[PDB]
Design a protein around this ligand. Structure first.
Ligand SMILES: O=C(N[C@@H](C(=O)NO)c1ccc(-c2cc(F)c(F)c(F)c2)cc1)C1CCCC1
Ligand SMILES: [Mg+2]
Ligand SMILES: [Mg+2]
Ligand SMILES: [Mg+2]
Ligand SMILES: [Mg+2]
Ligand SMILES: [Zn+2]
Length: 889
């Protein structure tokens, strides 16, 4: 297995200036002819010319129109085409080839493949080499002239990057289109699409240059009525980049295309963004509410790459976070502005501190800029994306909006049209830092440790108040646990956004303040503090760290009720829950270990329950925030705090805590469920796809959260509410009715009803599958077998496979059945999927990421399944590398 090392970067001995492609799609094969106009670089030392080319069937290869012969002048081993240096010219030359590829049977969905009746490419990271020979790395920038030909009846719409400069008829019912894209680009941004596509379109006029941009959104004909929201999101994305960043789109046209089979969410190919249908298509009758934020996020994300990734690209793949972390940060700013709901930021933090913190304490832990890789298909991680986004966001917190915008414009202006590295971005931020500090000696050298140091820092506090001196001090310490990447961890530049709350009136005691912690510890002192405050720490979640606030539950309750910052309120609630969970977990664990016949559990704090009631009953409080406070922290968040976690004991712990709170608040929950109905389920705009109300969707989230709590509690006659909910026009409601009916004898009646409502829309059916998969059913294993035999079958669609299996893996009690049968089931699915899609097989390994954090019996059971998968003779490179790292081999 070849390991690539970040420190080994060296420019190529060759240059590719022009790519001229002819892609001829036929029924049983696709023929690709390519001429590369090439040159010798200043770094050349007379080496062999080696092209990447994976799984290509050679018809011919030539240099300057002289056909080369295998064995004598070149070798090809299905991965590398080597032309021996004695046959490589010393000045500008043309390399040409004709190869045969087979998109129909390309079920790995990389390179050129068929998704239903659409031919589509996916070239990031190293997929272009599956289409034709290339030096397949992002610093090999070239011009592209691309012709596609195909049967006209089957493939009337032909698309590639750049301007469509010719369309022509071909004998035999064929036709072609030629696309010329003069600006230099890396090959991972090449794309082609051919299909019987239908569209919606609009014209957007840029803010400053007043350029007309044509916007097109495409899908198969069946789903063309689901394209409206995506088009609105694209217009919103363009306006946001103009308004916040002053950045306009540079091209005459932007196409977005939905396909049914896609490994991830979407891809930013220049002028031709390609999407998983689940991240582009929605309608109010056929989609759950989550689709609306998802489409907004993903359309925005791909659009923002036009600058951060496309116009400014990567020198090499180790710089991935420079485009992905920065584009996620841009998407987060956009979505926060578009939704105007505090839950947008909270949802990103909730994901980071569960999924990403788990990764960062697992054997897979890596910094946002890794030092090495084997599989690029395994590099696209929540660490690179989501911790990367938080590292990119910390620059905005440190600089403030005005100087952040100044620094970002420096980055764009200096690097536009070129490759870049993480250091280029830090340099631009540093220039703004010097301006803000009015000190040309200020620097951000320490900040670079956020790119190289793995693991989550822990930040802890101690406080002191002198009533006579009116002087308050916050003593802060940071620590990162040593791991496989650094034996000694260095202190980071940690910005701590803080407020000081007066506990008597709830008011702010100081102005906006961001503490800059740059040492292992520091003491921050505040004078003229008239009363002992309660500190509001890491406002907005100002650094990606474990926060140890050292506050009492009384202090946390005061913040939960009265603080101004949504995150600190949410975090104070989280911390109250965590203290309770850890205490009850240990009480249950001791009773299990000691086989006690009787024992005591510490009750939930009654003032905390009163505080939840107070917030729930406040009509001016936010419905989305309310849904968070009645929900315990995610299992994957909890697990970072418990060694040898017994999942059954955790399930009993959560059940006790939910029952304690419900025993006091269920009548409140029911009253709110009923009173929220009118606004939550308002149908005024049901047939307007342009009208999306994020507050209303949060009201539905709150109702559906309360309904779940009341259903689990067997609240009297709640089944009546469940049945009525199943008649709602909103899929979020009627699918909720299925999941909450799991606790009643009506489950299979609702299973059949909602199946019939879902079966005729491909994406809705996938949402139905997820709802079944995560249903809290004692017979879930039998239900999964039924889904396999009746619905999923041998589908190779990643959306189908992920929908059936991933939600079930979050069933704490059932997936972690002590027999190991859930681990065995998912391992069988992984091995089956690995035969045709290694990238998706590795995604399906997700539940194993926490294996070494569980109790010793479950550790053994998971390790046995991972070792079984590793022993499969036909294991893919992707899956083998991933499991070897995960099991510490
Ligand atoms: O969709 C997303 N991410 C995209 C993305 O960054 N889009 O900008 C993304 C991820 C992995 C690949 C990728 C890599 C490979 F190595 C492959 F082989 C391959 F097939 C595909 C391609 C695109 C989520 C949702 C929005 C942002 C996070
Ligand atoms: Mg092949
Ligand atoms: Mg405008
Ligand atoms: Mg299908
Ligand atoms: Mg290891
Ligand atoms: Zn991206």
């Amino acid at each position: 297995p070849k390991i690539h090392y970040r420190k080994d970067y060296k420019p190529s001995g060759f240059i590719i200036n022009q790519v001229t492609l002819n892609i001829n799609i036929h029924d049983q094969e696709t023929i690709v002819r390519s001429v590369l106009d090439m040159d010798i670089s200043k770094h050349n030392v007379g080496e062999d010319l080696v092209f990447d080319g994976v799984g290509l069937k050679i018809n011919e290869i030539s240099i300057n129109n002289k056909k080369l012969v295998e064995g004598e002048e070149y070798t090809y081993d299905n991965e590398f085409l080597t032309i021996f240096s004695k046959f490589v010219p010393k000045s500008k030359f043309a390399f040409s080839s004709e190869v045969i590829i087979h998109p129909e049977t390309n079920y790995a969905l990389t390179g050129l493949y068929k998704s239903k009746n659409i031919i589509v490419s996916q070239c990031e990271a190293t997929g272009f080499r599956r289409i034709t020979f290339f030096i397949d790395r992002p610093d090999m920038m070239a011009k592209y002239d691309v012709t596609v030909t195909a049967d006209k009846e089957k493939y009337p719409v032909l698309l590639s990057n750049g301007d469509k400069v010719n369309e022509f008829e071909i004998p035999g019912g064929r036709h072609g289109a030629r696309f010329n894209d003069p600006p230099l680009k890396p090959c991972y941004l090449f794309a082609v699409v051919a299909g019987d596509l239908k569209h919606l379109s609009a014209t957007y006029i840029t803010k400053y240059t007043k350029k007309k941009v044509e916007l097109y959104v495409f899908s198969e004909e069946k789903y063309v009525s689901k394209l409206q929201w995506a088009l609105e999101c694209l217009k919103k994305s363009m306006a946001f980049d103009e308004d916040y960043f002053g950045l306009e789109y540079d091209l005459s046209r932007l196409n977005l295309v939905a396909v049914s089979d896609f490994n991830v969410g979407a891809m930013e190919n220049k002028g031709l963004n390609i999407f998983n249908a689940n991240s582009l298509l929605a309608s109010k009758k056929n989609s759950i509410d989550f689709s609306y934020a998802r489409i907004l996020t993903v359309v925005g994300h791909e659009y923002f790459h036009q600058y951060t990734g496309n116009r400014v690209t990567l020198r090499d793949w180790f710089q991935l976070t420079l485009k992905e972390g920065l584009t996620v940060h841009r998407e987060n700013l956009f979505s926060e502005e578009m939704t105007k709901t505090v839950t947008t930021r909270l949802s990103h933090v909730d994901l980071l501190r569960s999924v990403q913190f788990l990764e960062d304490s697992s054997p897979l832990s890596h910094p946002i800029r890794p030092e090495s890789y084997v599989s690029m298909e395994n590099f696209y991680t929540t660490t690179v994306y989501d911790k990367g986004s938080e590292v990119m966001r910390m620059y905005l917190t440190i600089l403030g909006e005005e100087y952040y915008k100044k620094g970002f414009d420096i980055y764009i202006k200096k690097n536009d049209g070129n490759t870049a590295t993480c250091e280029d971005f830090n340099y631009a931020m540093e220039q703004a830092y010097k301006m803000k500090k009015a000190d040309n000696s200020a620097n951000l050298n320490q900040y670079l440790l956020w790119f190289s140091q793995s693991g989550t820092p822990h930040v802890s506090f101690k406080y002191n108040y002198d009533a006579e001196k009116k002087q308050y001090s916050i003593h802060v310490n940071q620590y990162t646990k040593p791991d496989e990447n650094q034996k000694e961890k260095k202190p980071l530049f940690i910005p701590i956004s803080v407020g000081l709350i007066n506990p008597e009136n709830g008011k702010e005691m100081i102005s906006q303040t961001t503490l800059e912690l740059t040492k292992e510890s520091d003491t921050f002192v505040f004078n003229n503090i008239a009363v002992k405050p309660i500190p509001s720490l890491f406002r907005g979640f100002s650094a990606p760290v474990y926060i140890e606030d050292q506050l009492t539950d009384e202090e946390r309750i005061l913040l939960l009720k009265y603080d101004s910052d949504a995150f600190v309120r949410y975090n104070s609630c989280t911390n109250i829950y965590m203290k309770q969970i850890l205490m009850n977990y240990n009480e249950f664990l001791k009773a299990k270990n000691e086989k006690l016949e009787s024992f005591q559990l510490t009750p939930v704090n009654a003032q905390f329950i009163d505080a939840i009631k107070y917030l729930l009953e406040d009509p001016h409080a936010d419905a989305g925030f309310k849904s968070y406070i009645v929900s315990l922290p995610q299992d994957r968040y909890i697990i970072n705090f418990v060694s040898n976690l017994d999942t059954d004991v955790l399930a009993d712990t959560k059940e006790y805590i939910y029952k304690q709170i419900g025993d006091k608040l269920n009548d409140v929950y029911y009253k709110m469920f009923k009173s929220l109905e009118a606004k939550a389920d308002d149908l005024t705009y049901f047939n307007d796809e342009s009208h999306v109300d994020f507050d209303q969707m949060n009201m539905r989230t709150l109702r559906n959260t309360l309904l779940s709590l009341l259903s689990k509690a067997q609240y009297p006659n709640i089944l009546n509410e469940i049945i009525e909910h199943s008649k709602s026009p909103y899929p979020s409601n009627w699918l909720t009715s299925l999941s909450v009916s799991a606790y009643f004898d009506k489950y299979f009646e609702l299973y059949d009803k909602t199946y019939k409502l879902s079966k005729d829309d491909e994406l809705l059916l996938q949402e139905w599958l997820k709802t079944v998969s995560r249903s809290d059913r004692k017979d879930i294993y039998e239900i999964l077998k039924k889904l396999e035999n009746e619905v999923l079958k041998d589908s190779k669609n990643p959306n189908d496979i992920r929908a059936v299996y991933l939600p079930f893996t979050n069933n704490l009690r059932r997936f972690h059945d002590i027999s190991g049968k859930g681990y065995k089931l998912i391992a069988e699915v992984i091995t089956k999927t690995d035969k045709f899609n290694p990238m998706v097989a590795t995604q399906l390994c997700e539940p194993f990421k926490l294996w070494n954090k569980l109790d010793t019996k479950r550790q053994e059971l998971m390790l046995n399944e991972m070792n079984t998968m590793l022993q499969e003779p036909q294991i893919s490179n992707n899956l083998k590398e991933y499991l070897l790292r995960l099991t510490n081999k």
